[PDB]
Scaffold this active site. Structure first.
Site, PDB file in Angstrom:
ATOM      1  N   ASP A  36       0.825  -1.221   0.000  1.00  0.00           N
ATOM      2  CA  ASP A  36       0.000   0.000   0.000  1.00  0.00           C
ATOM      3  C   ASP A  36       0.852   1.261   0.000  1.00  0.00           C
ATOM      4  O   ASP A  36       1.384   1.693   1.074  1.00  0.00           O
ATOM      5  CB  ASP A  36      -1.057  -0.033   1.145  1.00  0.00           C
ATOM      6  N   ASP A 222      -1.195   5.312  -5.812  1.00  0.00           N
ATOM      7  CA  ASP A 222      -1.734   4.475  -4.666  1.00  0.00           C
ATOM      8  C   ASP A 222      -2.064   3.063  -5.045  1.00  0.00           C
ATOM      9  O   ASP A 222      -3.169   2.790  -5.549  1.00  0.00           O
ATOM     10  CB  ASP A 222      -2.993   5.144  -4.077  1.00  0.00           C
TER      11      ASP A 222
HETATM   12  C1  LIG Z   1      -5.544   0.107   1.264  1.00  0.00           C
HETATM   13  C2  LIG Z   1      -6.957  -0.282   1.646  1.00  0.00           C
HETATM   14  C3  LIG Z   1      -6.878  -1.735   2.169  1.00  0.00           C
HETATM   15  C4  LIG Z   1      -7.399   0.668   2.746  1.00  0.00           C
HETATM   16  C5  LIG Z   1      -8.828   0.317   3.107  1.00  0.00           C
HETATM   17  C6  LIG Z   1      -9.300   0.347   4.425  1.00  0.00           C
HETATM   18  C7  LIG Z   1     -10.614  -0.027   4.599  1.00  0.00           C
HETATM   19 CL1  LIG Z   1     -11.238  -0.042   6.272  1.00  0.00          CL
HETATM   20  C8  LIG Z   1     -11.467  -0.402   3.561  1.00  0.00           C
HETATM   21  C9  LIG Z   1     -11.051  -0.439   2.241  1.00  0.00           C
HETATM   22  C10 LIG Z   1      -9.718  -0.078   2.028  1.00  0.00           C
HETATM   23  C11 LIG Z   1      -9.137  -0.051   0.643  1.00  0.00           C
HETATM   24  N1  LIG Z   1     -10.009   0.138  -0.348  1.00  0.00           N
HETATM   25  C12 LIG Z   1      -9.661  -0.052  -1.775  1.00  0.00           C
HETATM   26  C13 LIG Z   1     -10.144  -1.400  -2.353  1.00  0.00           C
HETATM   27  C14 LIG Z   1      -9.060  -2.398  -1.945  1.00  0.00           C
HETATM   28  C15 LIG Z   1      -7.828  -2.503  -2.610  1.00  0.00           C
HETATM   29  S1  LIG Z   1      -6.853  -3.689  -1.785  1.00  0.00           S
HETATM   30  C16 LIG Z   1      -7.960  -4.188  -0.552  1.00  0.00           C
HETATM   31  C17 LIG Z   1      -9.094  -3.392  -0.797  1.00  0.00           C
HETATM   32  C18 LIG Z   1     -10.242  -3.457   0.169  1.00  0.00           C
HETATM   33  C19 LIG Z   1     -11.558  -3.189  -0.116  1.00  0.00           C
HETATM   34  N2  LIG Z   1     -12.195  -3.307   1.107  1.00  0.00           N
HETATM   35  N3  LIG Z   1     -11.265  -3.617   2.144  1.00  0.00           N
HETATM   36  C20 LIG Z   1     -10.041  -3.709   1.560  1.00  0.00           C
HETATM   37  C21 LIG Z   1     -10.290   1.092  -2.507  1.00  0.00           C
HETATM   38  O1  LIG Z   1     -11.107   1.851  -1.978  1.00  0.00           O
HETATM   39  O2  LIG Z   1     -10.052   1.240  -3.724  1.00  0.00           O
HETATM   40  N4  LIG Z   1      -7.878  -0.158   0.510  1.00  0.00           N
END
Ligand SMILES: CC1(C)Cc2cc(Cl)ccc2C(N[C@@H](Cc2cscc2-c2cn[nH]c2)C(=O)O)=N1
Ligand SMILES: [Zn+2]
Ligand SMILES: [Zn+2]
Ligand SMILES: [Zn+2]
EC number: 3.4.23.46
Length: 393
Positions: A36, A222
């Protein structure tokens, strides 16, 4: 040191990120950790959870040191929280070194771990300024470089449920992972990997906005974000243009919101009606930019559901932002991306794992010369909370 060992060290599921194996503790506990570049904590699941079978067990590590300090990390979409400590960390398929790093042991979380993703933790690769609870918690990569002679750079090749691979080269650039030129855009400020977009075109046509609109309120690179995310005004200009180009097809509003798939008969998707998108990034030289050109195959992402096996169905992977442009896994998958922290710049080259189209190619091209770049950076209104905090560095 020789990147042959680091090639192909990432795996993932589509739309659930890319993870690298890391070991924590002594004796070593191997965990799959999300890469990340959008955050700056190393945090690992550290208690049972329905979607984990594996987690960091601090009690089994003879080298764990508790920092006796909690950390709470809210997202717009969920949260994680935990207990800070330090442990020995190595990357089995990375540099041959071990380092003592901060680790947040996640004890509670909401909407963070997802059903079936296969990672148990996150590696925040961005800078101390955005670390939680503050910028005194040294991020993993800062510890790595300080404790070893690992060069202060890493590069990502992300190769697009469904399973994905790629490479994180730590300490270097592996020339087998890209073709053509590597072009660099400056890191504007070391917090996120923040960059400056100076022009946007959709199928050759200039969006014609004030370029500060492209970077409102920042633009970032990102790997932890799925979509290309665009500020509201930009997102609306982009949807207008892509709709125009694809107007032989009248999709529902849900599709443009990312809320609905659109399908064609298997093998018949009319890729040619969907335009390429070029983002021109500020070059290292004043008045120069270069462009990265994204194919519709990057932003229309296939999804297989049960009731249409003889259809190819797609989700629109460009979405509206209120916290600036985010060049997420969607953009990154075309490219080999070099996070040259040493020279405060980010490089883009065409990936050796190409996404191809019939007649067009994802591309990195320059230079393009102007009357500046431009100034296209946005200056975020300085809060009193920000102003007051002392940074004794
Ligand atoms: C880096 C990370 C894990 C940070 C995150 C925290 C939380 Cl609480 C929920 C989603 C995310 C999130 N969302 C991504 C989607 C994603 C990419 S890797 C894992 C995910 C993910 C989606 N839901 N939880 C993780 C996005 O919004 O594009 N990414
Ligand atoms: Zn392994
Ligand atoms: Zn002070
Ligand atoms: Zn500080």
């Amino acid at each position: 040191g020789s990147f042959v060992e680091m090639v192909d060290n990432l795996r993932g599921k589509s739309g659930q990120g890319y993870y690298v194996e890391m070991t924590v503790g002594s004796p070593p506990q191997t965990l799959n950790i999300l890469v990340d570049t959008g955050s700056s904590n190393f945090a690992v699941g550290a208690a049972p959870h329905p979607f984990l079978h594996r987690y960091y067990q601090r009690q089994l590590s003879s080298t764990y040191r508790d920092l006796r300090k909690g950390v709470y990390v809210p997202y717009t979409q969920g949260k994680w929280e935990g207990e800070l400590g330090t442990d020995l960390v190595s990357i089995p398929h990375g540099p041959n070194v071990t380092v003592r790093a901060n680790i947040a042991a996640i004890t509670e979380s909401d909407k963070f771990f997802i059903n079936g993703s296969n990672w148990e933790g996150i590696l925040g690769l961005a800078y101390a300024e955005i670390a939680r609870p503050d910028d005194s918690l040294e991020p993993f990569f800062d510890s790595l470089v300080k404790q070893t002679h690992v060069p202060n750079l890493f590069s990502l090749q992300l190769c697009g449920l469904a399973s994905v691979g790629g490479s994180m080269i730590i300490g270097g650039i592996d020339h087998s992972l890209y073709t053509g030129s590597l072009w660099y855009t400056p890191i504007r400020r070391e917090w996120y990997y923040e960059v400056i977009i100076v022009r946007v075109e959709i199928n050759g046509q200039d969006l014609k906005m004030d370029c500060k609109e492209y970077n409102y309120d920042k633009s970032i690179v990102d790997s932890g974000t799925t979509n290309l995310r665009l500020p509201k005004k930009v997102f609306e200009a982009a949807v207008k243009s892509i709709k125009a180009a694809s107007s032989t097809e009248k999709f529902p509003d849900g599709f443009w919101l990312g809320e609905q798939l659109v399908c064609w008969q298997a093998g018949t998707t009319p890729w040619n009606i969907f335009p390429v998108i070029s983002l021109y990034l500020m070059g290292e030289v004043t008045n120069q930019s270069f462009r990265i050109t994204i194919l519709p195959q990057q932003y229309l992402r296939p999804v297989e559901d049960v009731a249409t096996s003889q259809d190819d169905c797609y989700k629109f992977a460009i979405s509206q932002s209120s916290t600036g442009t985010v060049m997420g896994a969607v953009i990154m998958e075309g490219f080999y991306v070099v996070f040259d922290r040493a020279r405060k710049r980010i490089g883009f080259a065409v990936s050796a794992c190409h996404v191809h189209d019939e007649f067009r190619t994802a591309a990195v091209e320059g230079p393009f010369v102007t009357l500046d770049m431009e100034d296209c950076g946005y200056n975020i209104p300085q809060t009193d909370e920000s102003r007051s905090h002392h940074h004794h560095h």
